[PDB]
Design a protein around this ligand. Sequence first.
Ligand SMILES: Nc1nc2c(ncn2[C@@H]2O[C@H](COP(=O)(O)OP(=O)(O)OP(=O)(O)O)[C@@H](NP(=O)(O)OP(=O)(O)O)[C@H]2O)c(=O)[nH]1
Ligand SMILES: [Cl-]
Ligand SMILES: [Cl-]
Ligand SMILES: [Cl-]
Ligand SMILES: [Cl-]
Ligand SMILES: [Cl-]
Ligand SMILES: [Mg+2]
Ligand SMILES: [Mn+2]
Length: 351
Amino acid sequence: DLGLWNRLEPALAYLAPEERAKVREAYRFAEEAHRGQLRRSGEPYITHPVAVAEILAGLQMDADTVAAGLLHDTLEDCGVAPEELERRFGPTVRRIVEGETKVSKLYKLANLEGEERRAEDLRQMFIAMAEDVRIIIVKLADRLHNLRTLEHMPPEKQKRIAQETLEIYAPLAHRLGMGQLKWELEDLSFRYLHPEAFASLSARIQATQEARERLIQKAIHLLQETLARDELLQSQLQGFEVTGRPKHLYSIWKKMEREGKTLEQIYDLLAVRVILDPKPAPTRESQALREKQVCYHVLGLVHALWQPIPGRVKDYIAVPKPNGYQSLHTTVIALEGLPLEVQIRTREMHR
Ligand SMILES: Nc1nc2c(ncn2[C@@H]2O[C@H](COP(=O)(O)OP(=O)(O)OP(=O)(O)O)[C@@H](NP(=O)(O)OP(=O)(O)O)[C@H]2O)c(=O)[nH]1
Ligand SMILES: [Cl-]
Ligand SMILES: [Cl-]
Ligand SMILES: [Cl-]
Ligand SMILES: [Cl-]
Ligand SMILES: [Cl-]
Ligand SMILES: [Mg+2]
Ligand SMILES: [Mn+2]
């Protein structure tokens, strides 16, 4: 057995049972449609829309979006008409899979090459044609998985796709507030577009990586304990996760070229992330309050645990960034005299 559903299924627990039922129906429909089809990796095609759905489930997208992630390829390859996807999964799931597949072609057609701000007018083209932003998110999840599996492609295609992601899709994830997605698109694009510079920067970081993650883990273990042993915070919380922030390799090398610095000359600010999953609240309004309330509760315990550097609290929950970015940030003195940046946000805020 393929066993792809058994990997996706756990990621779907945030959906109501009726919604997970729509996603199982979508999985089987995709399973049937792509039967016998193969990816250039030698893996059966279904591996891709399952990976794409899995990315959207990680991002906690609505049921129609994740089901559309499984069906996002069925129309072109498999003798499936859009009428079938609307008849079987409703018009929003069709709308989205039709939109993700249709835009792929528009970018092929569009004449903007070597043009002053060509990516700006091409990014706006998708923005203008796709009023339901879910279409863009599915396209971003698709491009991410394609990049994740870019080794099974000619090196010519590898750089064409990496550059296109760097001009179009990574900036589109920025506009949409999907920074988690944006970072990964950037680093994966950087890997294939400039391989020589990626392999050199990665090697330098892999020398101090033994000590850096050793320190970051002391702070993670300590902050995990502190949060878990706080009875009131846990009373309003379903779950939580404390992680180390990954080095944004593309941005690190980008600032080295611009500021004319070396990887030794640039300051490695250690950062940790607290992701909070609040417990289901009896009303929609009470759920919204809990979301805010739980991040400020954490800010306080972080300040009880580590001494806060003055003027480093940043409240993007009260005042989100222009792309709708919401998180709380505080720079503290942790690790015996070291600056540690703490990012605090909910599961819903983590995009
Ligand atoms: N990255 C990657 N892509 C793979 C793999 N196996 C198959 N592919 C397909 O290659 C495709 C690369 O793009 P393409 O060159 O435009 O597609 P094509 O018409 O040459 O494809 P076929 O040889 O007929 O399959 C890609 N298409 P997709 O619709 O997802 O996205 P696009 O880039 O916006 O057009 C993949 O589905 C694989 O292992 N990795
Ligand atoms: Cl069925
Ligand atoms: Cl834009
Ligand atoms: Cl962002
Ligand atoms: Cl982020
Ligand atoms: Cl410490
Ligand atoms: Mg091709
Ligand atoms: Mn696809």
